[PDB]
Design a binder for these strands. Structure first.
Length: 293
DNA sequence: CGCGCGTTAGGGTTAGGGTTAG
DNA sequence: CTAACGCGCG
């Protein structure tokens, strides 16, 4: 019946509506724009080495493409191609649909989407396979995904972790206690709050004495951090590590501060990962096999 | 009337990547 | 993709 046509990225013409395949070179996770809709920016590339920046809006958070890391594969349906500031641009059209897939080779091809129904043929399977192979042979694995035991000060990195606590601070910032099974090379800093709003298992937090790190998010991230469920697994993008000379108790001690600065550049944000994700499986293996006395 | 299935029509701003800090 | 839309049935 329905046979969707997929336009190569080097053949895109402005003023049309197309369906596309691509690999994610960069993406901003969905964030509240100054309008009424969540916004998501996604730069994709295909075999033609031509890049396309897509600008997607939706009132439903899950309707936007479910992207978890660079190298993921995406398929877009009903994307409008236009020209903004003498540059080609992709934007949301009426009835926009999205499928996403893991980029790792050999992994099962499992569509991630919010659409109730979607079209998927064997040719889609083969195209996802081909894009996976092309991304393996033409892109690089992300060096920004580090475990806590590998981080260095003054550094931006992406963290796959589990959340253990939340707390209010000053309104402009919000506290998140997280862990990933590994101990940082330097003990984490400890943000102080007069009246603690520690939503979480206090005994379980303290038992993990130094595997827990404090993360202070700011501005637009605050709202998102307020809506997170304790125990869920998170990916925090472009977290910033700094070194510190004296702690919150005004003692002399070198500590690692983790900040999630305001704005959305370099993908700074948070995304909740489902337990069906394989990185979450490895994270579970690390959380269970953690050194603690 | 109530279903129901086939057809296809469609409100247009949000932000349009690129790390000051706190 | 999804649900408003309209003609054709029970």
């Amino acid at each position: 019946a329905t046979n969707y046509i997929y336009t190569p990225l080097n053949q895109l013409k402005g003023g049309t509506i197309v369906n596309v395949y691509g690999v994610v070179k960069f993406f901003k996770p969905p964030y509240l724009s100054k309008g009424t809709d969540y916004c998501s920016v996604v730069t994709i590339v295909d075999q033609t080495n031509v890049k396309l920046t897509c600008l997607l809006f939706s009132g439903n958070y899950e309707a936007l493409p479910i992207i978890y890391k660079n190298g993921d594969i995406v398929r877009f349906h009903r994307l409008k191609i236009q020209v903004y500031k003498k540059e080609t641009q992709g934007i949301t059209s009426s009835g926009f649909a999205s499928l996403t897939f893991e980029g790792t080779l050999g992994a099962p091809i499992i569509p991630r989407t919010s659409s109730k129904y979607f079209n998927f043929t064997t040719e889609d399977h083969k195209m996802v396979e081909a894009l996976r192979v092309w991304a393996s042979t033409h892109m690089s694995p992300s060096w920004t995904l580090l475990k806590l035991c590998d981080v260095q000060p003054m550094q931006y990195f992406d963290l796959t972790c589990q959340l253990l606590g939340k707390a209010e601070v000053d309104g402009a910032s919000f506290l998140l206690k997280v862990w990933d099974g590994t101990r940082t090379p330097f003990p984490s800093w400890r943000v102080l709050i007069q009246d603690l709003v520690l939503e979480g298992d206090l005994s379980h937090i303290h038992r993990l004495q130094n595997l827990t790190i404090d993360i202070l998010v700011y501005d637009n991230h605050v709202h998102v951090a307020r809506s997170l469920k304790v125990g869920s697994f998170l990916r925090i993008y472009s977290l910033h590590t700094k070194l510190q000379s004296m702690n919150s108790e005004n003692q002399t001690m070198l500590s690692l501060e983790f900040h999630l600065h305001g704005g959305t550049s370099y993908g700074r944000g948070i995304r909740v990962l489902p337990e069906s994700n394989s990185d979450v499986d490895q994270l579970k293996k690390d959380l269970e096999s953690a050194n603690l006395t």
